[PDB]
């Protein structure tokens, strides 16, 4: 089932400002979180040593 | 001598004990029957602390004897004496001095009581005082008692009592983990926060920027509500602060009461009940 013949009516019940701001916050949060989680697992995309060596030779 | 508005209140009576017998003033201090008793307990106490400083732990000629303010110390008797009176020169002195200190504090409290009765004010102060008196008693009476000997009390010396606190605390390995300790510390800290906030508020309103008039109750509430969305309000902050400080003393008294008598193992181990629940 997609959508009510009347699922506009949710905004007669829920404040558009609060729902909107909530969405903004939750989404930004989720983005940051998942980015962190990924940054802590294999899918790290930074400390890979590719595509060209940036620490020449050794120490750093 | 009196404040410029004091004579109108210096009424007669209100004692608990004594009546007109000691019902008079001396300079600015009120005497009263418990002040006379208090002064006796106090004077003999101090004068004895003076004799202890005079004799030293090994005699007046010994290198350990001292009048250096940081190092003079009168310590309790060994545990071998249990709850008996121990010889004067073997921790007895400390016992008597203790009796005098406890009696002086209880007298002091009762004198604040006669003073509340005189002025017609609440008895919040001496009640609150009684929490410090309670704390002092666990540290010299209750705990060493539950522990079968008065020697478990702390010594009366500026740094030696610090040493006492230190080794008794470390007998439990990591005292910071004492949960009542954690509480008490939080209250001492929170107390310190409310005090700093109240202080700041009153001084920030009764003395505003030049060019502004004494501020108002409305200002007071509007400010802490502006910053942190709440203002407990004038009255209540006086109520809270009293809660914080008295509770801080309370949890200190209980945090030390449980260190021995009700817990002998190290303290972090206590937290085991939490790592072992059947949830994990």
């Amino acid at each position: 089932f997609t959508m009510n013949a009347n699922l506009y009516k949710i905004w007669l019940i829920l404040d558009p400002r609060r729902v909107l701001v909530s969405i903004v916050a939750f989404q930004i949060v989720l983005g940051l979180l998942i980015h962190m989680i990924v940054l802590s697992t294999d899918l790290n995309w930074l400390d890979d040593n590719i595509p060209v060596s940036y620490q020449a030779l050794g120490k750093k | 001598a009196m404040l410029s508005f004091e004579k109108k209140y210096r009424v007669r009576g209100g004692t608990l004990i004594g009546g007109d017998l000691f019902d008079f003033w001396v300079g600015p201090f009120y005497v009263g029957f418990f002040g006379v008793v208090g002064f006796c307990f106090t004077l003999l106490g101090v004068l004895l602390i003076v004799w202890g400083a005079t004799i030293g732990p090994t005699g007046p000629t010994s290198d350990l004897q001292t009048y250096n303010l940081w190092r003079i110390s009168i310590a309790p008797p060994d545990l071998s004496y249990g709850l008996r009176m121990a010889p004067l020169t073997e921790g007895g002195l400390w016992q008597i001095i203790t009796i005098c200190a406890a009696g002086a504090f209880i007298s002091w409290a009762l004198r604040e009581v006669e003073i509340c009765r005189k002025l017609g004010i609440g008895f919040h102060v001496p009640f609150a005082f009684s929490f410090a008196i309670g704390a002092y008693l666990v540290l010299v009476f209750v705990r060493p008692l539950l522990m079968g000997a008065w020697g478990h009390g702390f010594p009366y010396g500026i740094l030696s009592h610090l040493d006492w606190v230190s080794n008794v605390g470390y007998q439990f390995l990591h005292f910071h983990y004492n949960p009542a300790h954690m509480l008490a510390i939080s209250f001492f800290f929170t107390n310190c926060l409310a005090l700093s906030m109240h202080g700041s508020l009153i001084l920030s309103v009764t003395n505003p920027q030049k060019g502004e008039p004494v501020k108002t109750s409305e200002h007071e509430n509007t400010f802490f509500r502006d910053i942190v969305g709440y203002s407990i309000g004038a009255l209540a902050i006086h109520r809270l602060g009293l809660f914080l400080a008295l509770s801080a003393a309370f949890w200190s008294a209980v945090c030390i009461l449980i260190s021995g008598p009700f817990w002998t193992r190290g303290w972090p181990e206590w937290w085991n009940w939490w790592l072992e629940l059947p949830l994990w």
Binding site: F1, N4, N6, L7, K9 | -
Partner: protein, 40 residues
């Protein structure tokens, strides 16, 4: 709830549909999960 007898029939209907739809998306995601990597 200061609601009338009819504005909870309407609401209940819409709530029920949205909720079962939710449970539906749920069974979808769980089946994809069982397909790629069975767990029982």
């Amino acid at each position: 709830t200061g609601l009338t007898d009819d504005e909870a029939k309407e609401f209940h209907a819409i709530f029920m549909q949205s909720m079962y739809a939710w449970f539906g998306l749920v069974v979808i995601a769980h089946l994809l999960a069982w397909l790629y990597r069975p767990w029982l």
